[PDB]
Design a protein around this ligand. Structure first.
Ligand SMILES: Cc1cc2nc3c(=O)[nH]c(=O)nc-3n(C[C@H](O)[C@H](O)[C@H](O)COP(=O)(O)O)c2cc1C
Ligand code: SF4
Ligand code: SF4
Ligand code: SF4
Ligand code: SF4
Ligand code: SF4
Ligand code: FES
Ligand code: FES
Lengths: 96, 80, 121, 216, 460, 209, 78, 29, 147
């Protein structure tokens, strides 16, 4: 919950609990992209490189409720763009 | 400010966010002393309850009391 | 990195802690200024020794002597040397980093002579 | 390394009973009487060693019985047994080899001693042999730095050792009589310089009553 | 003047080599238990002033003058405390290199017993516990035997020596700990606790054993005392320099031709001690790399400073060292001094009580570093890092073991730096480059373990 | 009886036999601590309360030094700052990088006092790595992660002195010291959760939270 | 920042009109170009941020390996 | 803002008053 | 570059002489207008003069017209809320002298009902800044043509 604290716009909203295997994990992770300013402080605070910001910009919609991203919509977005994220990380991490 | 029940927080149906209608749920003025607070409140006409603090009571502490003589049965055995 | 900050041995933080060394916000009311006038300063004392001078400070800490009184009780060497200058002129608004301007004309200049703009170094 | 946690087993658990014999009980009370009646907890160490000798290792049952006797909570016994190292909380062998690897005994050749024992027994420090006959352990200085190198076999110091001597000493302890303590072979003697004494060369001592002060 | 001539006529610890009996019949011939009754009837002030005029200093390593610290037990208004007053003897002999307190009990126990009785008289003690190492089992059984003979002769017990002073003597066999040799951890061991030290204040003389006043002495420090009292004090001042008076057992050991244990007057030169009472160095005086004159708790000395340095507290202190239990540990040039120092660090890691932070952690850092400097897996600037790590310990601890874990590494760095740097160059040529912390370039955490580099010291 | 003394130039009065840290608290001087809690017995294991007293050569423990008339005490001079940095270096050698999963993040004294009285960066890079330790199972209400212990002995003192649960103790020796019940037990007391509020580090944490 | 360690000139104009301001703005274009060329010719090595991890977040190769750096990261980003 | 630090973050600063503006200390005697 | 060398330095040692100069200048001004100047502070090449609402127009005239202090430009006006005070507001004027290359400050105090004199009589640029401070904090700037 460092991404939830440093975010200027307070877009992020998280709620955790102990998973069945005894680990720490999330049950809720939301982003209101109508609150987001795309600052990148959230990809800077995470000490595990989970949350990232893709180079994608082609995600316009016809409704404002498709922009209240939840955990499942983000996990699939990361499964999709992983190859692009690996390129950007392999050429950005040393400076970051 | 003290809460007004109906309009403090309630869960949204859409995504699970917590809503509100109380506009003073996050405002917290800070003052240097009690008298300034009370004056500012009265000048603005707000009704207030004062919460007098609770301070730790001073009592002597010695490292020697850990190692004192028991003329009778040991009450408890110390570890450290 | 830079060397004396990446040095692993003789690089204590309390020497390169420039934040906790911050310069205090000094405050000077008329009381603290008349004492500097009736008395002096650590650089130019004019104060009596012992508890006598201590209570002399105390007389000014409270309203015992005023600023106009000690402005009129100030000899020429006091004013002309601690309020004004030795020459008698008042000080001017100081500059931290002064700038002596200079003009460039002709060929070096950004614009030729005809245009209504010039060039300062 | 040191182990500070216990996991119960069929041979070392609080349900195994333990009880000092009449002899060790009499000795226990003679120990408890060395100390003030209220600070009988002070006795916890010698009683733990008495149990460690009656029973070859210091089990949880031993600790619990002693804490019963001294009316202390057991955890204040478990601390004591864990801290001091001579309380062996695992089953041991018949012959605990305690070899000094400290700087003096190393400059006098203890590494060859440890290697000879590691090759003879084919055992590493902190291990036990298939016979339950030799529990090895490298240790710190044992107060015999002058008669270096050295070793110990169940509270008995064997001194001024050589690898051949340590091998054959293990061969004797494995089977039958073991030699008496002190310098190996007794070709040399305890703390006198090996060449022979240079200092106290007489056969009757100066009695201090012959040189008293003019008072008294 | 020039010293080192102590003749047998002045040697206190006769029977150091089993020339005579230790039994009660033979200690009488030696003069033990001679006129103790009148010595008890002199009083506390005469005994204390005699030990004061004598200048008898501590023997466990801290040369605090005796007589003084015994007087601490006798302030005004002590009787009104209404309680027992105990005495303790620090016969624990955890100090690698040290052998003397063993010899003092397995050969001449009755001097120790009479020293307990007399220090107790001077300090008005009702008893005297003796803390012995558990590894010293047979020595303890002998001391109990002689203590029991003294009960038989009345020298200890009720109305000791027929005087008007009740006094018991109890043996307590400590089951293995170096730190328990320290003053306060000893007492907490006698209280049936872990041997974890206590802060000072409160001093033992005010609040000690079982809450009571008490005092912790070295075996030799009381063992000599009956003889200093019997024989007049002034002659003890005649030994040694002004503030470093008297005789002192020396346990020599190491790469010497003839390892030995001997008795000599203090302020004797180190070189005469090495050449005469022993066989000289193995390989010659110029086959000398260094010497450790107080055991592991003292920085090493180089050959230049062994040429003229007296074996006293003061001069050894003047060369940034000190006299401990006077146990000399000698080291030729055929040895790896760095291996000796890392061993001392592994020792102190094994004997830290684990109470205060700097010892708990700093000792393990020091071990992890010295195990690397042994193979060169380091940089040169890591040595100045190491000097700072020792300064992180040298004054922030409870007991003195933290300082004792620091100092030898300060002495290695002060003197034998190039050997460290040369081993490091040897690693940089023979294996590869290295960074801070022993990480190479190919080092990586693959499958739960580091694989791309050697790992010094890991045995588990 | 109340005495008088000096602390960073300020003068204060408190009763005899008192700890210096209580005096400093009276005079408002902020002093660090881990092992000292007001309602518990004293010990001196953390070694973070060190201050300079003109009477004694080394810095001394405010938590344990008795207060005496006329003693002068500085808490700002370079020796204290160095000693505090050194102690925190030592404390954070073998502390795991668990802050994100530690439930004390945002309310840990170790963070705050390392940021305030400690170094910007560490010099422990050793390849043999940090000490480890196993987690104990002392019951549902208290969750453990004992790689995070600093061995303050607040837990022990509370249990054995204010609660009456002497099952909690200090096993082992040295760096392998381990606070725990030597065998699997449960912290049977109705005051068990106050331990959670006492530990500065998140080695004992509330479980349903 | 470094405007004292790099050369440039300041245009000035009479008449106070819009034309003079336009000429000043174009002059500032060209002088800024001079400055860019100079800075590109002399960009010193070193850090780009204060080396005090109590103010500026550290690198990640330390935050993932050193304790004090992770603490400082946590506090600065909370 | 409820996560605000409980420890004082930056202690008292450092005087930079020139000595000509410091109130004189009387000589002790 | 093998090793980068950046010396360790305090950023405030750069200011000490300018600070002594500002102290002397403030002392002159307090001696010159004792009726008005209550105090002055200094902090890192920034001066501040503390006054009362009556003293604003006079001191501004001195700071605009006097030769040694030709503070002709008006950089800003700002109010600040300190509710702990009786007079919660604290109006702040910043000034500049292109002549001597210096800035200076000037602080007053006010309330939700006690107004402040307007310096539009002197600096026309204060019009908008005072309208801002009114709208933002509620301070009333007496004499203002269109507040
Ligand atoms: C950790 C530690 C261990 C010690 N171990 C011993 C020991 O085994 N034998 C000994 O004579 N002294 C040992 N000493 C030294 C002294 O016994 C003890 O500290 C104290 O100085 C008593 O010495 P004294 O009365 O003769 O002057 C040790 C000191 C420390 C700090
Ligand atoms: S980068 Fe976007 S999602 Fe992340 S903190 Fe900033 S505004 Fe919020
Ligand atoms: S792990 Fe990363 S994404 Fe998850 S809460 Fe922490 S900062 Fe946010
Ligand atoms: S320095 Fe080491 S041995 Fe001494 S008290 Fe501290 S932790 Fe224990
Ligand atoms: S277990 Fe927790 S409370 Fe107990 S000493 Fe360790 S850190 Fe402190
Ligand atoms: S206890 Fe340790 S891991 Fe947890 S927040 Fe504090 S410093 Fe971080
Ligand atoms: S060094 Fe081996 S017995 Fe002492
Ligand atoms: S607070 Fe004093 S050492 Fe812990």
């Amino acid at each position: 919950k460092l991404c939830e604290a440093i975010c200027p716009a307070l877009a992020i909203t998280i709620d955790a609990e102990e998973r069945i295997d005894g680990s720490r994990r999330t049950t809720k992770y939301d982003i209101d992209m109508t609150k987001c300013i795309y600052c990148g402080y959230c990809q800077e605070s995470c000490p595990v490189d989970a949350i990232v910001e893709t180079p994608n910009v082609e995600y316009a919609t016809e409704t404002r409720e498709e922009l209240l991203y939840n955990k499942e919509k983000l996990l699939a977005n990361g499964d999709k763009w992983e190859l692009e994220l690996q390129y950007a990380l392999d050429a950005d991490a040393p400076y970051r | 400010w003290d809460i007004v029940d109906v309009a403090n927080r309630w869960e949204n149906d859409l995504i699970g966010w917590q809503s509100s209608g109380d506009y003073m749920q996050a405002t917290q003025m800070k003052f240097t002393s009690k008298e300034s607070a009370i004056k500012f409140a009265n000048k603005q006409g707000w009704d207030f309850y004062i919460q007098e603090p609770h301070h730790r009571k001073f009592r002597v502490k010695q490292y020697a009391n850990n190692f004192v003589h028991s003329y009778g049965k040991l009450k408890h055995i110390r570890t450290k | 990195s830079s060397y004396p900050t990446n040095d692993i041995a003789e690089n204590p933080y309390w020497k390169r802690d420039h934040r906790r060394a911050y310069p205090q916000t000094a405050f000077f009311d008329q009381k603290t200024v008349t004492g500097l006038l009736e008395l002096g300063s650590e650089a130019t004392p004019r104060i009596a020794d012992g508890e006598a001078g201590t209570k002399a400070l105390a007389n000014i800490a409270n309203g015992g002597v005023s600023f106009t009184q000690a402005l009129g009780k100030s000899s020429k060497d006091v004013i002309y040397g601690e309020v004004l200058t030795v020459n008698g002129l008042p000080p001017v608004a100081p500059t931290l980093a002064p700038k002596q301007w200079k003009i460039i004309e002709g060929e070096a200049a950004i614009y030729p002579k005809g245009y209504p703009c010039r060039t300062f170094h | 390394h040191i182990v500070s946690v216990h996991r119960n087993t069929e041979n070392n658990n609080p349900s195994i009973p333990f009880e000092f014999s009449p002899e060790n009980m009499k000795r226990a009370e003679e120990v408890i009487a060395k100390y003030p009646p209220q600070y009988k907890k002070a006795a916890v160490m010698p009683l733990l060693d008495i149990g460690q000798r009656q029973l070859g290792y210091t089990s949880i049952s031993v600790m619990n019985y002693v804490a019963k006797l001294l009316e202390m909570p057991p955890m204040r016994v478990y601390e004591v047994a864990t801290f001091y190292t001579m309380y062996n909380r695992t089953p041991m062998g018949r012959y605990h080899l305690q070899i000094c690897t400290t700087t003096p005994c190393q400059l006098c050749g203890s590494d060859g001693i440890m290697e000879a024992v590691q090759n003879t027994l084919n055992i590493k420090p902190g291990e036990t042999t298939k016979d339950n006959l030799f529990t090895l352990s490298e240790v710190e200085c044992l107060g015999a730095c002058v008669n270096a190198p050295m070793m110990a076999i169940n509270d008995d110091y064997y001194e001024d050792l050589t690898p051949e001597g340590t091998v054959k000493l293990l061969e004797d302890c494995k089977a039958g009589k073991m030699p008496t303590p002190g310098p190996e072979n007794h070709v040399r003697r305890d703390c006198e310089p090996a060449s022979g004494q240079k200092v106290l060369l007489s056969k009757e001592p100066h009695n201090v009553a012959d040189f008293l002060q003019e008072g008294i | 003047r020039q010293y080192g001539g102590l003749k047998d006529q002045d040697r206190i610890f006769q029977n150091l080599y089993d020339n005579y009996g230790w039994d009660l019949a033979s200690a009488r011939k030696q003069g033990d238990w001679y006129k103790t009754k009148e010595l008890i009837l002199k009083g506390d002030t005469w005994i204390i002033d005699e030990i004061k005029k004598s200048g008898l200093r501590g023997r466990g390593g801290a040369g605090f003058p005796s007589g003084l610290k015994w007087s601490f037990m006798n302030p005004p208004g002590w009787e009104k405390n209404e309680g027992p007053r105990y005495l303790v003897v620090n016969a624990d002999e955890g100090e690698p290199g040290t052998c003397k307190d063993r010899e003092i009990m397995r050969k001449d126990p009755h001097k120790l017993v009479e020293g307990c009785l007399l220090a107790g008289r001077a300090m008005n003690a009702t008893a005297a516990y003796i803390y012995i190492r558990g590894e010293f089992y047979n020595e303890a059984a002998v001391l109990q035997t002689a203590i029991n003979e003294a009960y038989a002769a009345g020298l200890i017990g009720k109305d000791a020596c027929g005087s008007g002073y009740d006094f018991d003597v109890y043996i307590h066999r400590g089951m293995g700990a170096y730190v328990c040799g320290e003053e306060t951890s000893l007492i907490e061991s006698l209280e049936g606790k872990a041997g974890k030290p206590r802060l000072k204040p409160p001093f033992p003389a005010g609040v000690g054993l079982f809450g009571r006043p008490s005092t912790v002495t070295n075996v030799e420090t009381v063992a000599v005392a009956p003889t200093i009292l019997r024989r007049g004090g002034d002659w003890f001042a005649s030994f040694g320099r002004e503030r470093n008076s008297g005789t002192k057992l020396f346990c020599i050991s190491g790469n010497v031709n003839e390892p030995c244990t001997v008795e000599e007057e203090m302020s004797i030169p180190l070189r005469e001690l090495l050449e005469k009472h022993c066989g000289g160095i193995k390989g010659g005086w110029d086959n000398l790399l260094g010497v450790i004159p107080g055991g592991c708790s003292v920085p090493i000395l180089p050959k230049n400073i062994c040429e003229d340095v007296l074996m006293d507290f003061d001069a050894l202190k003047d060369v940034q060292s000190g006299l401990g239990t006077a146990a000399v540990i000698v080291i030729n040039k055929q040895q790896d001094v760095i291996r000796a120092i890392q061993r001392f660090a592994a020792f102190y890691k094994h004997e830290s009580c684990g109470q205060c932070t700097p010892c708990r952690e700093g000792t393990t850092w020091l071990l992890k570093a010295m195990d690397r400097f042994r193979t060169g897996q380091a940089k040169e600037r890591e040595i100045d890092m190491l000097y700072e790590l020792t300064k992180d310990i040298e004054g922030h601890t409870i007991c003195a073991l933290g300082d004792a874990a620091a100092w030898p590494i300060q002495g290695l760095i002060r003197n034998f730096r190039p050997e460290m740097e040369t081993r490091m160059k040897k690693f940089h040529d023979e294996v590869g480059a290295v960074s801070v912390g022993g990480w190479m370039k190919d080092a990586r955490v693959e499958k739960g373990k580091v694989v791309g580099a050697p790992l010094p010291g890991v045995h588990h | 009886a109340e005495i008088e003394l000096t602390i960073d130039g300020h003068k204060v009065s408190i009763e005899a036999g008192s700890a210096l840290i209580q005096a400093c608290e009276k005079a408002g001087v902020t002093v660090p601590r881990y092992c000292y809690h007001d309602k518990l017995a004293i010990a001196g294991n953390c070694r973070m309360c060190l201050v300079d007293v003109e009477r004694a050569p080394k810095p001394v423990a405010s938590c344990a030094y008795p207060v005496a008339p006329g003693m002068v005490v500085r808490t700002d001079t370079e020796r204290v700052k160095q000693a505090r940095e050194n102690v925190m270096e030592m404390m954070l050698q073998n502390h795991p990088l668990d802050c994100p999963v530690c439930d004390q993040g945002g309310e840990c004294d170790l963070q705050d006092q390392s940021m305030r009285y400690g170094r910007d960066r560490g010099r422990f890079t050793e390849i043999t790595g940090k000490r480890s330790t196993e987690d104990k199972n002392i019951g549902p209400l208290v969750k453990t992660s004992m790689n995070r212990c600093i061995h303050c002995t607040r837990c022990v003192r509370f249990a054995n002195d204010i609660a009456g649960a002497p099952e909690l103790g200090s096993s082992g020796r040295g760096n392998d010291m381990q606070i725990g019940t030597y065998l699997e037990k449960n912290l049977n007391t109705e005051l068990s959760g106050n331990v959670i509020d006492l530990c500065p580090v998140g080695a004992l944490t509330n479980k349903p939270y | 920042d470094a405007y004292d360690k790099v050369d440039f000139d300041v245009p000035v104009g009479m008449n106070g009109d819009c034309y003079d301001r336009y000429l000043i703005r174009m002059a500032e274009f060209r002088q800024s170009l001079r400055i860019i060329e100079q800075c590109c010719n002399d960009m010193p090595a070193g850090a780009v941020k204060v080396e005090d991890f109590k103010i500026n977040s550290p690198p990640r190769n330390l935050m993932k390996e050193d304790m004090e750096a992770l603490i400082h990261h946590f506090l600065l980003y909370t | 803002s409820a996560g605000s630090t409980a420890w004082e973050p930056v202690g008292p600063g450092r005087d930079d008053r020139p000595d000509s503006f410091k109130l004189p200390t009387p000589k002790p005697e | 570059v093998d090793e980068v060398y950046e010396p360790i330095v305090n950023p405030a040692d750069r200011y000490l002489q300018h600070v002594s100069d500002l102290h002397q200048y403030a002392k002159y001004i307090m001696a010159a207008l004792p009726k008005y100047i209550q105090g002055f502070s200094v902090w890192k090449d920034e001066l501040t003069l503390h006054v009362a609402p009556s003293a604003v127009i006079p001191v501004t005239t001195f700071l605009r017209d006097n030769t040694s202090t030709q503070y002709k430009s008006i950089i800003d006006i700002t109010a600040v809320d300190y509710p702990s005070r009786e007079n919660r507001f604290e109006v702040v004027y910043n000034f500049l002298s292109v002549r001597h290359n210096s800035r200076i400050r000037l602080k007053t105090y006010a309330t939700e009902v006690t107004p402040v004199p307007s310096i539009t009589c002197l600096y026309e640029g204060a019009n908008w800044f005072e309208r801002e401070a009114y709208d933002m904090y509620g301070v009333f700037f007496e004499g203002h043509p269109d507040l």
